[PDB]
Design a protein around this ligand. Sequence first.
Ligand SMILES: CC(C)CCC[C@@H](C)CCC[C@@H](C)CCC[C@@H](C)CCOC[C@@H](CO)OCC[C@H](C)CCC[C@H](C)CCC[C@H](C)CCCC(C)C
Ligand SMILES: CC(C)CCC[C@@H](C)CCC[C@@H](C)CCC[C@@H](C)CCOC[C@@H](CO)OCC[C@H](C)CCC[C@H](C)CCC[C@H](C)CCCC(C)C
Ligand SMILES: CC(C)CCC[C@@H](C)CCC[C@@H](C)CCC[C@@H](C)CCOC[C@@H](CO)OCC[C@H](C)CCC[C@H](C)CCC[C@H](C)CCCC(C)C
Ligand SMILES: *C/C=C(C)/C=C/C=C(C)/C=C/C1=C(C)CCCC1(C)C
Ligand SMILES: *C/C=C(C)/C=C/C=C(C)/C=C/C1=C(C)CCCC1(C)C
Ligand SMILES: *C/C=C(C)/C=C/C=C(C)/C=C/C1=C(C)CCCC1(C)C
Ligand SMILES: CCCCCCCCCCCCCCC
Ligand SMILES: CCCCCCCCCCCCCC
Ligand SMILES: CCCCCCCCCCCCCC
Ligand SMILES: CCCCCCCCCCCCCC
Ligand SMILES: CCCCCCCCCCCCC
Ligand SMILES: CCCCCCCCCCCCC
Ligand SMILES: CCCCCCCCCCCCC
Ligand SMILES: CCCCCCCCCCC
Ligand SMILES: CCCCCCCCCCC
Ligand SMILES: CCCCCCCCCCC
Ligand SMILES: CCCCCCCCCCC
Ligand SMILES: CCCCCCCCCCC
Ligand SMILES: CCCCCCCCCCC
Ligand SMILES: CCCCCCCCCC
Ligand SMILES: CCCCCCCCCC
Ligand SMILES: CCCCCCCCCC
Ligand SMILES: CCCCCCCCC
Ligand SMILES: CCCCCCCCC
Ligand SMILES: CCCCCCCCC
Ligand SMILES: CCCCCCCC
Ligand SMILES: CCCCCCCC
Ligand SMILES: CCCCCCCC
Ligand SMILES: CCCCCCCC
Ligand SMILES: CCCCCCCC
Ligand SMILES: CCCCCCCC
Ligand SMILES: CCCCCCCC
Ligand SMILES: CCCCCCCC
Ligand SMILES: CCCCCCCC
Ligand SMILES: CCCCCCC
Lengths: 231, 231, 231
Amino acid sequence: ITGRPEWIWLALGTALMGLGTLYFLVKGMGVSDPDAKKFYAITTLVPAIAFTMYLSMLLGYGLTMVPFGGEQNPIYWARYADWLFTTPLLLLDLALLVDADQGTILALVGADGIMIGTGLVGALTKVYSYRFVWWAISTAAMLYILYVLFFGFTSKAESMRPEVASTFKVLRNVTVVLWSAYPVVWLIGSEGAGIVPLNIETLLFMVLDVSAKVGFGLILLRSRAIFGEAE
Amino acid sequence: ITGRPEWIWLALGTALMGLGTLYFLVKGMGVSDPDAKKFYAITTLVPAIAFTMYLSMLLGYGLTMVPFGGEQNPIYWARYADWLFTTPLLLLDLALLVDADQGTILALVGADGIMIGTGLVGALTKVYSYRFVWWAISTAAMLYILYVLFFGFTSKAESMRPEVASTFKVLRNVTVVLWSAYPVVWLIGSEGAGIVPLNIETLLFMVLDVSAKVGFGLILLRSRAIFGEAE
Amino acid sequence: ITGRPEWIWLALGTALMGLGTLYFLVKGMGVSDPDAKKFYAITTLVPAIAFTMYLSMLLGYGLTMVPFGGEQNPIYWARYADWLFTTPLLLLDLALLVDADQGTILALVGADGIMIGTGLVGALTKVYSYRFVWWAISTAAMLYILYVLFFGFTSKAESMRPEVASTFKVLRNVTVVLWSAYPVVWLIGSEGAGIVPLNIETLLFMVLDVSAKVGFGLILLRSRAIFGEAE
Ligand SMILES: CC(C)CCC[C@@H](C)CCC[C@@H](C)CCC[C@@H](C)CCOC[C@@H](CO)OCC[C@H](C)CCC[C@H](C)CCC[C@H](C)CCCC(C)C
Ligand SMILES: CC(C)CCC[C@@H](C)CCC[C@@H](C)CCC[C@@H](C)CCOC[C@@H](CO)OCC[C@H](C)CCC[C@H](C)CCC[C@H](C)CCCC(C)C
Ligand SMILES: CC(C)CCC[C@@H](C)CCC[C@@H](C)CCC[C@@H](C)CCOC[C@@H](CO)OCC[C@H](C)CCC[C@H](C)CCC[C@H](C)CCCC(C)C
Ligand SMILES: *C/C=C(C)/C=C/C=C(C)/C=C/C1=C(C)CCCC1(C)C
Ligand SMILES: *C/C=C(C)/C=C/C=C(C)/C=C/C1=C(C)CCCC1(C)C
Ligand SMILES: *C/C=C(C)/C=C/C=C(C)/C=C/C1=C(C)CCCC1(C)C
Ligand SMILES: CCCCCCCCCCCCCCC
Ligand SMILES: CCCCCCCCCCCCCC
Ligand SMILES: CCCCCCCCCCCCCC
Ligand SMILES: CCCCCCCCCCCCCC
Ligand SMILES: CCCCCCCCCCCCC
Ligand SMILES: CCCCCCCCCCCCC
Ligand SMILES: CCCCCCCCCCCCC
Ligand SMILES: CCCCCCCCCCC
Ligand SMILES: CCCCCCCCCCC
Ligand SMILES: CCCCCCCCCCC
Ligand SMILES: CCCCCCCCCCC
Ligand SMILES: CCCCCCCCCCC
Ligand SMILES: CCCCCCCCCCC
Ligand SMILES: CCCCCCCCCC
Ligand SMILES: CCCCCCCCCC
Ligand SMILES: CCCCCCCCCC
Ligand SMILES: CCCCCCCCC
Ligand SMILES: CCCCCCCCC
Ligand SMILES: CCCCCCCCC
Ligand SMILES: CCCCCCCC
Ligand SMILES: CCCCCCCC
Ligand SMILES: CCCCCCCC
Ligand SMILES: CCCCCCCC
Ligand SMILES: CCCCCCCC
Ligand SMILES: CCCCCCCC
Ligand SMILES: CCCCCCCC
Ligand SMILES: CCCCCCCC
Ligand SMILES: CCCCCCCC
Ligand SMILES: CCCCCCC
């Protein structure tokens, strides 16, 4: 385990997702409101899944070697298994907040699936130049998601409760900034151009992941917006 | 096929899931009620999926060799492919019975996914001691599911029709007893401590599977609880 | 890339799915109706997914070699990854058109999953004779889907708006004819009996895919049936 310099960030990531999971689980114990239960369910599942996949990376299961550039390159494939489930869940949190129509939810989740799936293919592609073709397609899918979060959702929120509008706005901004960093880290890290070494890359992803999941969740679950308006 | 002593239980399992599938399909032919159609759909799909995966194990496709303990260990991975889809379907049957809120359904299905996914990782893990780490996490996810089935669902059922309350109670009890045996069999069988040989392990899983799927389905689909109250 | 004679059909397929995707995306820009948004979302996702998987086949990622018949046989596994997601989406388009009950939708999607999953197992099976066992099970699942599209849906459509009835009828007929060709092509092509060479097989699948996705989508998205009745 300790033979990989990035182990420390995997261990920290595992611990923080674990602690985040336990905290949200305990916090959601005293919740009977059906709307709030949905948000607690979605939001607690996110670090729970991330916990399992961080642990899989820490223990070495979620790592494979991919030959490109005439080298055996360590690729943590478990990230994509995580993101495949957790990024649509995060989008669902946002979509449910603003009472998105079903068509838009399907568009988001579908685009997200394409984003992660093509990122995975890019990560495992042995022809070096083609890795960036997949990166570009995945990034286009991300750009679509970001467009919808801004020019389909933000104007929907203004027509809703002020607490849901303000909470959505914060979470939207957090999401757009944090999510946009991922293709950059991939591009310059071990999966892409290889300018940033894997240990630093792992640190960067860990900071992004904890912020995008536990940070996000802390903001969401402390908000009154997740409760139905009741007396 | 006959070169594996466990083939007989795989063959029997295949036949019983097949027959179970055909029986539920025929039985559901004369059903127009929209609620009953949901239960027939869910409940017929369960042995249909199990049929395909038993057949895959029988024909040898759903088997791989995993090196641990300095041995090549036969691991039937097809079980997890089965359970990944059939256990949430079984939980959906229960959840729909008691008209569970969406948040609770998501919690159940999500926990179930974690249960099966981590069981799969445990099954394929090459570091012997780590297999039991995954077993423990999976078992914790199972315990969460069982907690919800008792302390989130049972009190919901009492507020519903007597036929749905009584049927849920029976199916809940069947589910908790049968499902709890699976981590025990895994732990002592070829995936875990290796005390019980694979042929007996396969027998045990076959008895559990047929009971948890066809047995469960027979109880559910004979009940009046799957029909909306109509005149 | 050009080393495989079928590359031309993969390239054409990629281009046509890409163009189809862009066309539906642009066309759906000026849509606010919640019902129409659902259909645009579903129908645009279908060629988008197919685009990615055609590209994966073109670049060689979505190809593996399967030993059977004492030969190394090129099997494009990416087709199943495509179909796993796009065929239920296509069925959802049809089901939503006729306002299918949830039980029937689950039956369709479930049968479809079995159809594609067993086709995949058949495609990767190393025992030649067993490949056709999987083909038969998959074809039985297809026959179930076709039965439901005719003897569960058609009589539902007649009870609905004339525009939805007529559009459903056309799309149903297109779907039944086109989908039925797939098991035939598989059976006689490289996955099955090997009578038709892979380059021609790839052409046939490309024509079917573009017709079943872009052709289908063009018919659906030009129809008034995807809009709620409004003044
Ligand atoms: C609505 C939305 C959800 C839509 C989703 C968008 C989605 C279509 C985007 C593309 C997803 C697709 C790329 C997933 C591919 C998974 C693949 C990387 C798994 C690894 O297999 C790749 C090679 C080794 O590199 O296997 C060696 C060859 C082996 C023989 C491989 C054979 C097994 C195949 C992998 C079977 C395909 C199953 C499905 C791809 C499962 C989906 C997995 C998940 C990652 C989407
Ligand atoms: C809401 C709920 C549904 C949440 C679900 C909870 C879920 C997160 C729990 C964990 C699921 C995750 C462990 C699934 C892992 C699948 C993996 C075992 C497949 C086999 O690949 C493992 C190694 C060989 O041992 O592959 C050799 C290396 C290869 C290069 C592997 C690369 C391909 C990757 C497998 C791509 C990942 C795709 C997804 C994991 C598909 C999910 C499969 C299913 C089993 C969940
Ligand atoms: C409600 C509906 C959706 C129901 C769906 C119906 C469905 C049950 C029908 C059967 C699906 C099932 C056959 C999928 C099998 C995927 C499998 C082909 C992936 C490739 O792995 C096969 C072998 C190499 O040939 O791997 C070499 C051995 C490796 C060690 C394999 C270990 C990893 C396993 C693949 C883990 C299983 C994960 C799930 C099968 C993911 C589903 C993938 C998708 C194709 C259904
Ligand atoms: C909790 C984890 C999160 C929120 C991860 C989000 C990941 C992304 C937004 C990844 C995007 C990528 C691209 C846009 C292209 C390059 C490859 C990816 C997958 C890193
Ligand atoms: C129809 C099949 C059923 C109902 C199978 C259920 C399986 C489980 C409840 C399995 C649980 C496991 C654990 C709790 C940890 C050990 C590994 C598993 C996957 C066997
Ligand atoms: C857009 C792609 C479409 C509509 C593909 C549809 C594919 C099928 C209907 C495939 C059916 C098969 C069988 C019925 C058995 C043989 C194997 C398959 C998977 C080709
Ligand atoms: C939950 C059931 C676990 C109990 C399994 C008992 C199996 C006993 C069979 C005898 C064990 C075989 C050892 C000698 C080969
Ligand atoms: C490929 C995995 C996609 C599924 C991710 C799980 C989250 C799905 C959320 C469903 C949103 C509801 C749409 C109507
Ligand atoms: C990883 C596979 C999970 C999907 C299993 C299929 C059953 C899902 C049931 C969905 C329940 C509805 C939730 C609102
Ligand atoms: C194995 C992949 C199955 C999921 C395919 C995605 C489409 C699912 C459509 C869901 C229909 C809604 C059912 C209530
Ligand atoms: C085009 C949609 C406007 C809002 C999205 C902001 C785009 C941020 C660019 C991210 C950079 C990724 C490499
Ligand atoms: C803690 C929830 C109470 C109901 C669940 C019963 C737990 C049964 C233990 C199963 C043993 C698994 C090894
Ligand atoms: C049995 C349902 C009647 C409508 C389905 C038509 C069946 C077409 C046969 C397709 C041939 C596949 C090999
Ligand atoms: C070895 C690198 C070759 C450059 C490939 C860049 C492709 C990026 C695609 C963006 C449209
Ligand atoms: C393929 C990238 C798409 C980003 C621009 C958005 C196009 C308009 C979409 C309107 C729903
Ligand atoms: C070789 C076996 C070593 C013991 C591992 C047991 C781990 C179980 C984890 C329960 C918390
Ligand atoms: C991680 C195992 C959880 C089992 C105990 C239940 C904790 C309380 C959950 C309340 C929804
Ligand atoms: C080598 C071919 C052997 C014939 C197998 C055909 C099986 C088809 C199953 C249809 C019930
Ligand atoms: C297993 C093939 C099934 C095709 C015939 C349909 C049987 C009746 C189903 C009624 C819903
Ligand atoms: C509750 C604390 C969870 C921490 C477990 C994972 C940390 C890795 C330690 C090596
Ligand atoms: C309808 C009977 C189904 C039995 C087929 C599978 C049994 C295995 C026989 C070797
Ligand atoms: C918009 C045009 C998309 C075409 C890209 C794929 C075609 C393959 C060219 C070799
Ligand atoms: C992106 C950083 C999130 C900060 C989380 C703090 C939560 C305090 C309520
Ligand atoms: C767990 C055993 C189930 C027994 C099924 C019998 C069904 C008869 C109605
Ligand atoms: C199966 C062929 C479909 C033809 C599509 C033409 C669409 C024109 C409206
Ligand atoms: C990590 C355990 C949380 C302790 C309770 C915090 C207040 C809800
Ligand atoms: C007005 C909301 C600002 C949130 C920005 C957070 C950036 C990490
Ligand atoms: C809208 C601001 C996005 C900032 C992107 C930063 C990526 C590191
Ligand atoms: C396995 C075939 C079932 C025969 C009909 C049973 C009575 C519905
Ligand atoms: C009162 C219901 C009892 C059911 C127990 C079944 C145990 C297998
Ligand atoms: C509530 C009783 C559970 C019984 C567990 C038995 C496992 C073999
Ligand atoms: C492929 C681009 C489509 C151009 C607009 C067509 C009319 C909606
Ligand atoms: C009456 C609808 C006829 C459609 C047939 C299309 C065959 C490809
Ligand atoms: C209902 C007519 C089906 C035609 C099947 C054609 C397959 C090539
Ligand atoms: C009903 C299909 C069973 C196939 C068994 C072949 C040994």
